[PDB]
Design an enzyme around this catalytic site. Structure first.
Site, PDB file in Angstrom:
ATOM      1  N   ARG A  68       0.763  -1.244   0.000  1.00 52.23           N
ATOM      2  CA  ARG A  68       0.000   0.000   0.000  1.00 52.23           C
ATOM      3  C   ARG A  68       0.800   1.305   0.000  1.00 52.23           C
ATOM      4  O   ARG A  68       0.217   2.348  -0.177  1.00 52.23           O
ATOM      5  CB  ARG A  68      -0.948   0.046   1.196  1.00 52.23           C
ATOM      6  CG  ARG A  68      -2.154  -0.901   1.011  1.00 52.23           C
ATOM      7  CD  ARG A  68      -3.027  -0.824   2.253  1.00 52.23           C
ATOM      8  NE  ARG A  68      -2.537  -1.688   3.338  1.00 52.23           N
ATOM      9  CZ  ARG A  68      -2.983  -1.591   4.586  1.00 52.23           C
ATOM     10  NH1 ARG A  68      -3.813  -0.596   4.928  1.00 52.23           N
ATOM     11  NH2 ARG A  68      -2.538  -2.445   5.537  1.00 52.23           N
ATOM     12  N   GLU A 242       4.082 -14.747  -3.736  1.00 55.64           N
ATOM     13  CA  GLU A 242       2.741 -15.142  -4.207  1.00 55.64           C
ATOM     14  C   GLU A 242       2.835 -16.256  -5.227  1.00 55.64           C
ATOM     15  O   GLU A 242       1.975 -17.159  -5.245  1.00 55.64           O
ATOM     16  CB  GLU A 242       1.980 -13.950  -4.828  1.00 55.64           C
ATOM     17  CG  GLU A 242       1.758 -12.822  -3.779  1.00 55.64           C
ATOM     18  CD  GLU A 242       1.093 -11.640  -4.450  1.00 55.64           C
ATOM     19  OE1 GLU A 242      -0.174 -11.693  -4.553  1.00 55.64           O
ATOM     20  OE2 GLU A 242       1.836 -10.740  -4.939  1.00 55.64           O
TER      21      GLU A 242
HETATM   22  C1  HEM Z   1       1.834  -2.590  -6.539  1.00 57.23           C
HETATM   23  C2  HEM Z   1       2.102  -3.862  -6.141  1.00 57.23           C
HETATM   24  C3  HEM Z   1       1.221  -4.612  -5.207  1.00 57.23           C
HETATM   25  C4  HEM Z   1       1.716  -5.579  -4.428  1.00 57.23           C
HETATM   26  C5  HEM Z   1       3.165  -6.029  -4.506  1.00 57.23           C
HETATM   27  C6  HEM Z   1       0.663  -6.104  -3.627  1.00 57.23           C
HETATM   28  C7  HEM Z   1       0.818  -7.193  -2.758  1.00 57.23           C
HETATM   29  C8  HEM Z   1      -0.272  -7.905  -2.234  1.00 57.23           C
HETATM   30  C9  HEM Z   1      -0.189  -9.171  -1.552  1.00 57.23           C
HETATM   31  C10 HEM Z   1       1.065 -10.013  -1.436  1.00 57.23           C
HETATM   32  C11 HEM Z   1      -1.436  -9.519  -1.130  1.00 57.23           C
HETATM   33  C12 HEM Z   1      -1.768 -10.823  -0.384  1.00 57.23           C
HETATM   34  C13 HEM Z   1      -2.352 -11.908  -1.306  1.00 57.23           C
HETATM   35  C14 HEM Z   1      -2.215 -13.266  -0.594  1.00 57.23           C
HETATM   36  O1  HEM Z   1      -1.376 -13.470   0.287  1.00 57.23           O
HETATM   37  O2  HEM Z   1      -2.928 -14.194  -0.888  1.00 57.23           O
HETATM   38  C15 HEM Z   1      -2.312  -8.424  -1.498  1.00 57.23           C
HETATM   39  C16 HEM Z   1      -3.645  -8.355  -1.152  1.00 57.23           C
HETATM   40  C17 HEM Z   1      -4.447  -7.315  -1.626  1.00 57.23           C
HETATM   41  N1  HEM Z   1      -4.072  -6.235  -2.371  1.00 57.23           N
HETATM   42 FE1  HEM Z   1      -2.280  -5.671  -2.894  1.00 57.23          FE
HETATM   43  N2  HEM Z   1      -0.469  -5.450  -3.884  1.00 57.23           N
HETATM   44  C18 HEM Z   1      -0.209  -4.484  -4.811  1.00 57.23           C
HETATM   45  C19 HEM Z   1      -1.141  -3.624  -5.440  1.00 57.23           C
HETATM   46  C20 HEM Z   1      -2.514  -3.605  -5.165  1.00 57.23           C
HETATM   47  C21 HEM Z   1      -3.442  -2.716  -5.755  1.00 57.23           C
HETATM   48  C22 HEM Z   1      -3.052  -1.747  -6.864  1.00 57.23           C
HETATM   49  C23 HEM Z   1      -4.671  -2.879  -5.118  1.00 57.23           C
HETATM   50  C24 HEM Z   1      -5.963  -2.186  -5.379  1.00 57.23           C
HETATM   51  C25 HEM Z   1      -6.042  -1.001  -6.032  1.00 57.23           C
HETATM   52  C26 HEM Z   1      -4.487  -3.925  -4.143  1.00 57.23           C
HETATM   53  C27 HEM Z   1      -5.496  -4.386  -3.310  1.00 57.23           C
HETATM   54  C28 HEM Z   1      -5.242  -5.543  -2.532  1.00 57.23           C
HETATM   55  C29 HEM Z   1      -6.396  -6.227  -1.928  1.00 57.23           C
HETATM   56  C30 HEM Z   1      -7.836  -5.781  -1.931  1.00 57.23           C
HETATM   57  C31 HEM Z   1      -5.894  -7.328  -1.343  1.00 57.23           C
HETATM   58  C32 HEM Z   1      -6.672  -8.374  -0.549  1.00 57.23           C
HETATM   59  C33 HEM Z   1      -7.350  -9.425  -1.471  1.00 57.23           C
HETATM   60  C34 HEM Z   1      -8.175 -10.428  -0.669  1.00 57.23           C
HETATM   61  O3  HEM Z   1      -8.745 -10.146   0.394  1.00 57.23           O
HETATM   62  O4  HEM Z   1      -8.345 -11.578  -1.132  1.00 57.23           O
HETATM   63  N3  HEM Z   1      -3.161  -4.282  -4.189  1.00 57.23           N
HETATM   64  N4  HEM Z   1      -1.572  -7.426  -2.120  1.00 57.23           N
HETATM   65  C1  LIG Z   2      -3.679  -6.093  -6.834  1.00 61.38           C
HETATM   66  C2  LIG Z   2      -2.885  -7.274  -6.269  1.00 61.38           C
HETATM   67  C3  LIG Z   2      -1.499  -7.352  -6.474  1.00 61.38           C
HETATM   68  C4  LIG Z   2      -0.775  -8.427  -5.929  1.00 61.38           C
HETATM   69  N1  LIG Z   2       0.623  -8.528  -6.149  1.00 61.38           N
HETATM   70  N2  LIG Z   2      -1.416  -9.424  -5.270  1.00 61.38           N
HETATM   71  C5  LIG Z   2      -2.783  -9.340  -5.048  1.00 61.38           C
HETATM   72  C6  LIG Z   2      -3.419 -10.425  -4.349  1.00 61.38           C
HETATM   73  C7  LIG Z   2      -4.790 -10.406  -4.093  1.00 61.38           C
HETATM   74  C8  LIG Z   2      -5.533  -9.313  -4.566  1.00 61.38           C
HETATM   75  C9  LIG Z   2      -4.933  -8.270  -5.278  1.00 61.38           C
HETATM   76  C10 LIG Z   2      -3.531  -8.294  -5.532  1.00 61.38           C
HETATM   77 CL   LIG Z   3      -1.979 -14.841  -7.870  1.00 60.71          CL
END
Ligand code: HEM
Ligand SMILES: Cc1cc(N)nc2ccccc12
Ligand SMILES: [Cl-]
Ligand code: HEM
Ligand SMILES: Cc1cc(N)nc2ccccc12
Ligand SMILES: [Cl-]
Lengths: 362, 362
Positions: A68, A242
């Protein structure tokens, strides 16, 4: 009464958004306009500035997301103008191209028309826009098991997969007024994939593993000021674990650790040898190496946690409460090597935010 | 009113204990005896059977403990008879000897007299009975930083450490009626320690790392049926990650990962190389190897999680609710390689149980 809820969410969002945007003196009249729009029409329409900042706030409030720090640089594409399935398809193709950006991935969200009276205008069936199919029959498992139910729904609709381990699922979505979704094959020229090789173990390529460049999550709902954007796909770049610790490692996914152990030349016989852990480390090193060598954005979990520490610091400086879900923020490899492990987080839900919704298949 | 609380806790514990022991027909009269004892004396005294099963239930209910499959085989030593500091000291020496058992570690708890009216009879200052001292002055850090405050309190009382990185702290406890605790040096013949070597990297011994065989936690309170045993040290055998991923790895503990990386011949320059993760794996392999080679009990996290799955299965079969703290049950190395990561646990607190208490130093 839904009007009431809408109005209340509106007041809270507009006040907060405009305060962050330095626009506090405009709130009173904007709220005046909104209250009158809700009375007349039952809803209200966000300005482009509201929609963009709202999507950014929603990312900022995503408790489970370690990435974030970069919330304020999200690229927001406003597609509230689409009306036909060709426009939706082309918007999704465009999202893939612009988010991919020849490998220098741009965090992007494309926002389609919101629900009207809980009535969806566009419903995307894909979990991510780029994802591999999965199959199971007569004991044989092929591809990504997590995709089995969506793959079956697509083949009910006349799609047919080649039954490799890496078939790209078609885009599949339904328009208001249509009984069935439509599907479209992804043009392969739009989809970057990375073959997994290891920096010093030449045999690693024998596993013939690959993964796609860009995770573009397409089945969550963006809620902003009481407006429900159920169709709003968004992407970042991957954190390497991931792919290497979950998608390629989990027993209920590609389940590759025993094969990894064999190619790196270690026995997979004794828990005390920690061969699963060793395999995980080498697979995760290979994933980072491969994305880097190919010029496709990726972050490792240590660097990601360091960025997240800065996000925490920035929230404190801005005077904003930080929220987080520790159980998702820790990485699945060496979590106690990150500062996240050693602190706690308030898992309260703050809006704008992204939310789960029921799958229209299964 | 404290009498009321005591009586209530008593009814609940006795009913449950006796039901588990097949003794339900004896509850009514036992409760009769207890109610009369509480009226007369303000407290009640557990039978040896109650005390033993109570300590076992407390382990079974320890939400944070992955090793609970073996709860019913805890060795309970009843030392409610001690009255002098020599008896306490000798009981603690005896616990070390019998728990250690020449390396074939026996999970054991020694239970001293309980609090009377919240008045402690015996107060143990040690965090564990065997633990290394820690020092810091003029920029120089020596030994275990987590022991700094207890080490300083001991040196206030006339103890002096040699200021190696592995000084054994003395036993230190206070008797009711005494203003100050007393301390006693541990006889080295009672304390097994394991030098850390690696199964195939000969240089690993250059780090001159070691750890003690038996974790004997001595500062928690055992509560059973409303009786508060604030002095009741207990031990198991280690899970290897406690030593290799935390005690020897944490930056605020022995902080050895950069040294580990160097001896295993990898650069510690780039987060994307995952050198901390690789170092963690090799250090954790070395720890298991070393304990095994020396004939000292230890469990790896995969085997431990497999035992814990059986604990879950056994609870279901017995018709008992399972409670757990996911944030402590996952191991700090490859947690998603264990079934624990992929499920959730009800973190409710059930008694009998073990509880934190305030440190009399700091
Ligand atoms: C820019 C690089 C980004 C990285 C490296 C990143 C990384 C991650 C990771 C590692 C997770 C955990 C997924 C898991 O462990 O299963 C996650 C969850 C999440 N990310 Fe990010 N993220 C990024 C960008 C974004 C963006 C751009 C958004 C929305 C605009 C976002 C919204 C979320 C949401 C909503 C979750 C939770 C999904 C769920 O509850 O299943 N992410 N992110
Ligand atoms: C947007 C996003 C990026 C990322 N690297 N992982 C995610 C995992 C779950 C939901 C959104 C994700
Ligand atoms: Cl994935
Ligand atoms: C037999 C081998 C045993 C193993 C392998 C084992 C393993 C562990 C582990 C790994 C932890 C987590 C510590 C951490 O991550 O910081 C723990 C916590 C705990 N264990 Fe066990 N354990 C065993 C025996 C025992 C026994 C015999 C008892 C009590 C009779 C016990 C009571 C607990 C308690 C109370 C905690 C939580 C401590 C806290 O909150 O700080 N364990 N155990
Ligand atoms: C009794 C015990 C054993 C173990 N291996 N680790 C523990 C950590 C904390 C408290 C008690 C523990
Ligand atoms: Cl320890």
């Amino acid at each position: 009464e839904e009007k009431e809820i809408l109005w209340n969410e509106a007041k809270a969002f507009i006040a907060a958004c405009y305060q962050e945007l330095g626009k506090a003196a405009e709130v009173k009249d904007r709220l005046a306009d909104i209250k009158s729009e809700i009375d007349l029409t039952g809803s209200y329409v966000h300005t482009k500035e509201e929609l963009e900042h709202g999507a950014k706030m929603a990312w900022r409030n995503s408790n489970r997301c370690i990435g974030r720090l970069f919330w304020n640089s999200l690229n927001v594409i406003d597609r509230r103008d689409v009306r036909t399935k060709e426009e939706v398809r082309d918007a999704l193709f465009h999202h893939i191209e612009t988010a991919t950006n020849n490998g220098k991935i741009r965090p992007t969200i494309t926002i389609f028309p919101p629900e009207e009276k809980g009535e969806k205008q566009v419903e995307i069936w894909n979990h991510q826009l780029i994802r591999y199919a999965g199959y199971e029959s007569d004991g044989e498992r092929i591809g990504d098991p997590a995709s089995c139910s969506l793959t079956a729904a697509c083949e009910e609709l006349g799609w047919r997969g080649e039954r490799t381990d890496f078939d790209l699922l078609p885009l599949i979505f339904r328009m208001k007024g249509d009984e069935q979704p439509v599907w479209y094959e992804l043009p392969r020229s739009l989809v970057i994939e990375v073959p997994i090789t290891h920096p010093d173990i030449e045999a690693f390529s024998d596993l013939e593993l690959k993964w796609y460049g860009v995770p573009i999550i397409s089945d969550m709902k963006l809620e902003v000021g009481g407006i429900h954007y159920n169709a709003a796909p968004f992407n970042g770049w991957y954190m390497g674990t991931e792919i290497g610790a979950r998608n390629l490692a989990d027993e209920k996914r590609y389940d590759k650790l025993k094969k990894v152990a064999s190619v790196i030349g270690i026995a997979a016989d004794y828990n005390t040898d920690l061969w699963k852990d060793q395999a995980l480390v080498e697979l995760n090193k290979a994933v980072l190496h491969s994305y880097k060598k190919q010029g496709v954005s990726i972050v490792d979990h240590h660097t990601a946690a360091s960025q997240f520490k800065r996000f925490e610091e920035q929230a404190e400086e801005a005077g904003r409460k930080l929220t987080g879900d520790w159980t998702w923020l820790i990485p699945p490899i060496s979590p106690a090597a990150t500062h996240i492990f050693h602190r706690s987080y308030d898992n309260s839900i703050v809006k704008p935010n992204y939310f789960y919704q029921d799958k229209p298949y299964e």
